[PDB]
């Protein structure tokens, strides 16, 4: 039952259009031929692509045209003019400069998603919602901004706020290596990332709604605020890929305790200290340097000795096992993918978008386009607006307080390109 017909190419006729031969004109290529090539490549593999599209006997000049055939232009000036005029024909150097660039080209296509020609529009997305029994939703920081929590990377964002306390890379604040060397860096800003209580946006309730209708396969969040659980999302449906403040752990003795136990300490910018390591720690740090003379601290002891750390995932640290267990049973079995409120810059979570089956429609809901991903449909704007709008068109009811006011609210969808819409009010 392969649904990949949309991605299946039409086997072209014979080797390429070349075999002095056509120095200026050349065996020109059209977008349909190029796109069909890319499809052929991705459909049959590189081997078959190479065998068919090339003559049974040849020269090094096809190497340049396979590049043009795949819709690439070789930007090397000295190389261009040589080819324009000339017509083994090619030099040894250039012939290598070619083969390389072909491999890059092939790899770029093999590693690039091809958008579905039959899913470009808002109605498509709506109709799909009705038919979809397995929906995989990936949420970022954006879904929470409407609650006052700023996102990480917006101009109004977290990284900007602390960039004004000074640091070269404000992301180092969440760096694991640095935490081990200097836990003070993280704990200085830690209060800023403490989760608020018992609140959620309309968008959370949208995911809640999908779960009630039985359409929700899983919700993967990069968010540590734990708002998902409050909106009603169940433990089996939810994965916090980046960890949570639920618990904390001593980085020396590996003890585990309820996260709330360190919340006051964090509010006061004090180092949370493990009770059981506090003995040896006091020998290495007699003076009480824990706050925001190291002579007694041996080379094998770092500042993080005997320090608790929240179970959220730092850069360079390992994601929760639950993530790995879930992706392995999820990606293949999913018929739809929606990305909401994430720049998609942080791996492995971002690679979900690259590891999913080719026929699965991909939809983006965000205030910005994601340029490094190929999304079948991208609705640009506030995700609460966009949630209300879509819920209307399905004749659906979002289980949120702000629904009764929103259900009548009217939104404008302006198409700026194919598969691209700007949703406002």
């Amino acid at each position: 039952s392969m649904s990949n017909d949309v991605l299946k190419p039409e086997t072209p006729k014979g080797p390429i259009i070349i075999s002095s031969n056509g120095i200026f004109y050349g065996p020109s290529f059209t977008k349909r031929e190029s796109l069909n090539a890319r499809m052929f490549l991705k459909y049959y593999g590189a081997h078959k692509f190479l065998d068919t599209y090339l003559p049974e006997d040849l020269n090094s000049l096809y190497i340049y045209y396979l590049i043009k055939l795949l819709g690439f232009e070789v930007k090397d000036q000295a190389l261009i003019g040589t080819i324009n005029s000339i017509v083994d024909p090619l030099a040894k150097k250039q012939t290598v400069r070619l083969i390389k660039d072909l491999q890059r080209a092939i790899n770029k296509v093999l590693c690039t998603r091809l958008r579905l020609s039959n899913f470009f529009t808002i109605d498509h997305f709506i109709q799909k919602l009705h038919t979809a029994r397995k929906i995989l939703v990936l949420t970022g920081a954006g879904v929470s901004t409407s609650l006052g929590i700023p996102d990480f990377r917006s101009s109004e964002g977290f990284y900007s706020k602390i960039k004004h306390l000074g640091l070269d890379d404000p992301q180092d604040v969440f760096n694991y290596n640095i935490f081990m060397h200097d836990p003070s860096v993280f704990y200085n800003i830690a209060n800023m990332v403490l989760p608020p209580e018992k609140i959620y946006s309309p968008l959370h309730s949208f995911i809640k709604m999908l779960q009630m209708k039985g359409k929700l396969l899983r919700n993967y969040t990069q968010n540590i605020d734990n708002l998902e659980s409050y909106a009603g999302i169940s433990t089996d449906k939810l994965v916090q890929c980046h960890g949570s403040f639920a618990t904390a752990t001593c980085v020396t003795c590996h003890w585990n305790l309820p996260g709330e136990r360190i919340f006051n300490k964090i509010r006061n910018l004090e180092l949370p200290l493990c009770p059981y390591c506090y003995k040896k720690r006091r020998e290495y740090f007699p003076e009480g340097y824990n706050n925001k003379s190291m002579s007694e601290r041996p080379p094998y002891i770092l500042n993080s000795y005997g320090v608790l750390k929240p179970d959220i995932t730092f850069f360079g640290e390992a994601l929760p096992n639950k993530f790995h267990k879930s992706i392995r049973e999820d990606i293949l079995e999913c018929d739809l993918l929606i990305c909401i409120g994430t720049s998609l810059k942080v791996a492995p979570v971002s690679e979900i978008v690259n590891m999913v089956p080719s026929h699965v429609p991909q939809v983006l809901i965000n205030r910005d386009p994601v340029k490094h991903a190929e999304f079948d449909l991208s609705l640009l704007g506030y995700c609460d607006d966009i949630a209300a709008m879509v819920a209307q068109k399905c004749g659906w009811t979002i289980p949120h307080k702000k629904w009764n006011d929103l259900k009548n609210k009217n939104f404008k969808s302006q198409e700026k390109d194919k598969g691209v819409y700007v949703v406002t009010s």
């Binding site: 991605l7 003559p55 083969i99 092939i106 690039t112 020609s117 994601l319 791996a347 590891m355 999913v356």
Partner: protein, 97 residues
């Protein structure tokens, strides 16, 4: 760059290729089919295709459910304006417009 670890996503093999090509090439002024194909195919990572499996990933299982932690797909799919090649985006829709 540790595998399966949270990382902000956003080379001896290169010279190995230049060496490996110049070797099979220099003694000949007429290149072959099986020669050049095999010369290309060794610069392309292991991959599957849609006929061999419909469940093939959008990156052709170069990044798949099994290898995603080691995924090089992010590297290949990014070719910057600084790079040698220029990439032409091609998208066609089936529309009643």
């Amino acid at each position: 760059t540790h595998p399966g670890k949270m990382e902000l996503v956003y080379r001896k093999s290169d010279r190995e290729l230049t060496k490996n090509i110049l070797w099979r090439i220099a003694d000949k002024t007429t290149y072959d089919k099986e020669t050049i194909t095999d010369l290309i195919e060794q610069g392309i990572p292991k991959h599957s295709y849609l006929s061999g499996n419909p469940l093939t990933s959008v990156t052709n299982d170069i990044c798949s459910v099994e290898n995603y932690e080691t995924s090089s797909a992010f590297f290949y799919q990014q070719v910057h304006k600084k790079d040698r090649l220029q990439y032409l985006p091609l998208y066609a829709v089936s529309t009643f417009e």
